[PDB]
Structure formats: structure tokens, C-alpha cells
């Protein structure tokens, strides 16, 4: 047994290598700018009726 | 046996059934080659 503070299962769970040292100019990323850029890219790359009605290379020549 | 009637819910259910039938038809007709199945795996 050994008389530990934790239970054996708790000892196994919390002795994993992930529990190492676990003891209880300037800029911030611009999410808005990247959202606007993604919207612009989507615009630059391209209702009630049913679906069954509506539907009815840079490696081309390498040295090898 | 169900003795109840709906005005637009019946039409919506009919539309959903037709959509499911068409989707299953498309999937079955496109799964005739194993290449589509392999592509769907990485899809």
C-alpha cells in the first residue's frame, strides 16, 4: 500500500508525463482584418425550389 | 391509423421525403465506382 495521500487510481492518473511541473513593435492578432480578407477572397473566387428540380498545374511539367 | 390532418406540415414532410429519395438516388448512382468511395473517405 505505502500509505500515500492519493488513491492508487488517482496516483496513476496524475503521474502521467503530462503532469510535469503542474502545481496548483508590439502587436495583437487582428481577427477582424483576416475575416474581411477571407470575405474578399470568397467574393473573388466565385432558392425555395427543391434540389431534385434545380440540378435536373505548377507540377504539370517538372524535370521528370 | 392516425386521424389527424395538417395543412403545411404534410407538404413539408413530402418535400423532405422527396429530397431524401433524390439524395439516396444520387449516392447510389455515384457509388458505382470505388474511386468515389475512396474519395469520400478523405472528404
Amino acid at each position: 500500500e505505502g500509505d500515500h495521500k492519493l488513491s492508487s487510481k488517482a496516483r496513476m492518473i496524475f503521474n502521467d508525463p503530462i503532469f510535469n511541473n503542474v502545481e496548483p513593435f508590439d502587436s495583437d492578432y487582428d481577427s477582424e482584418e483576416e475575416k474581411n480578407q477571407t470575405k474578399k477572397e470568397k467574393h473573388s473566387r466565385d432558392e425555395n425550389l427543391p434540389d431534385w428540380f434545380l440540378e435536373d498545374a505548377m507540377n504539370a511539367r517538372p524535370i521528370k | 391509423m392516425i386521424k389527424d390532418k395538417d395543412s403545411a406540415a404534410d407538404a413539408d414532410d413530402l418535400e423532405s421525403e422527396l429530397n431524401a429519395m433524390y439524395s439516396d438516388y444520387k449516392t447510389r448512382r455515384s457509388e458505382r465506382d470505388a474511386k468515389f468511395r475512396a474519395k469520400q473517405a478523405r472528404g
Binding site: 427543391p50 428540380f53 | 407538404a11 422527396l18 429519395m21 439516396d24 447510389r28
Partner: peptide, 19 residues
């Protein structure tokens, strides 16, 4: 599976025109 065999073509078409 293929459950569409529960509806014949004429029934399916006449219900598609309903939509």
C-alpha cells in the same frame, strides 16, 4: 438500401408536381 421502390414512378412524379 434503395427504399424508393416503395413508390412507383407515376406516384413520385405526381407528388413532385405538388411541390
Amino acid at each position: 438500401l434503395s427504399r424508393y421502390v416503395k413508390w412507383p414512378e407515376y406516384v413520385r412524379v405526381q407528388r413532385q408536381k405538388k411541390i
